[PDB]
Each structure stands twice: as structure tokens, then as C-alpha cells.
Amino acid sequence: TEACVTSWLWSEGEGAVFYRVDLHFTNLGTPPLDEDGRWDPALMYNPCGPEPPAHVVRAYNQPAGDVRGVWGKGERTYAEQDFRVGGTRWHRLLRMPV
Amino acid sequence: TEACVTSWLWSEGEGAVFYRVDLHFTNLGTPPLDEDGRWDPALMYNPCGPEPPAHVVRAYNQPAGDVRGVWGKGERTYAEQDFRVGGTRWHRLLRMPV
């Protein structure tokens, strides 16, 4: 409802799944530790749910090198990763603008 | 079919920022595929928008590897990654499952 980018994640083999991930960004102002030093209650407050299954989350955040860069409706650049975790091969697309 | 999970991210220095990121995961079931069996979603589907600022997106989508801290308690626990992107230091808290 404010600012947004998209990612994609999918697996191969039997039980292949396919996911679109929309990343909604909400500007919260200043970094949460002020010079006083009090904490912004916004930090870790009211996390959204329910959460995706554990292997899916793990797959989304697995460290992996970029195999190539792609476009991208509207010539929008994405970095692609092709990796394996938990015996399963995953493909991942991340919005990466210059 | 929907699931969601929340991240936080913030930079240091002059003009530091602080964002919430709500990652909305949508299961697309079995989408149409080409020959061989390949999905090309960056070109098939429209992305969400409008986009957040460029450098914020690059920072969130950066690889960073080194889990340097664990935040929060019990069932709402977060892994912190701590990294620079061109002279700017960033912190990114990711939900980490069980």
C-alpha cells in the first residue's frame, strides 16, 4: 500500500512448488535506536502472518551466488540464483535495480 | 493462497533509514510452463509497485551471509545480518524458523 517490489521462487523435481513474493516496504523514519537511547517500539512489532512453511522460508533466504541477471517486464533488472538446499533444487529471482 | 512474514532493515550515518518489510508469499500452484518445463515469471507476470527507492531495494536484496546476532525471544526470533553496501552500513533482521 506504499512501496513494493516482487520476487519469485520455485523448486524443481516431484513436489515442485511455485511462489510469487511481494515485498511491501513501509518507511518508519529514523533507525530504531535514538541518541538517548530509547528504542522505537515499531521494531519487531506486530509481525505479519501466518508464516510460510519452514523449507520455503529457508529457501528464500539461502545464501547463493548470482548465476545471471535478467529482465524483467519493463526492462526491469533481476538477479537470478540457481542452488540446492535440502536435496531440493531452487530457482530465485530478486529485483536488483541500477 | 497466502502467507506472510516480516523483516526489518536500517542503515547508519547521514540520512539513515528504517524500513519494515512484509514479505507476502503467494502459492501459484502449477502455473503454465514452456517446453522442457521451465517457468519464466519475470516476463509472464506484472510486478507490484510503485517501487521503493533504488538503494533501499539493493540493500534488502543484497547477499550478506554472516549471521552476526540473534534478536527477540521464544517463538519470535530474528537473525541479524550486518553488511556494507558502498560505504553504507546496513542491518537486516530476518525471521528465522524452527
Curated annotation (Swiss-Prot), chains A, B:
Disulfide bonds join 4-48. It comes from the Viruses. It is found in: Virion; Host cytoplasm; Host mitochondrion. Capsid protein interacts with genomic RNA and assembles into icosahedric core particles 65-70 nm in diameter. The resulting nucleocapsid eventually associates with the cytoplasmic domain of E2 at the cell membrane, leading to budding and formation of mature virions from host Golgi membranes. Phosphorylation negatively regulates RNA-binding activity, possibly delaying virion assembly during the viral replication phase. Capsid protein dimerizes and becomes disulfide-linked in the virion. Modulates genomic RNA replication. The capsid protein is probably attached to the viral membrane through the E2 signal peptide. This domain is also required for the localization of the capsid protein to the juxtanuclear region and subsequent virus assembly at the Golgi complex. Homodimer; further assembles into homooligomer. Interacts with human C1QBP. Interacts (via N-terminus) with protease/methyltransferase p150. This is Capsid protein. The chain holds residues 150 to 247 of 1063 of the full protein.
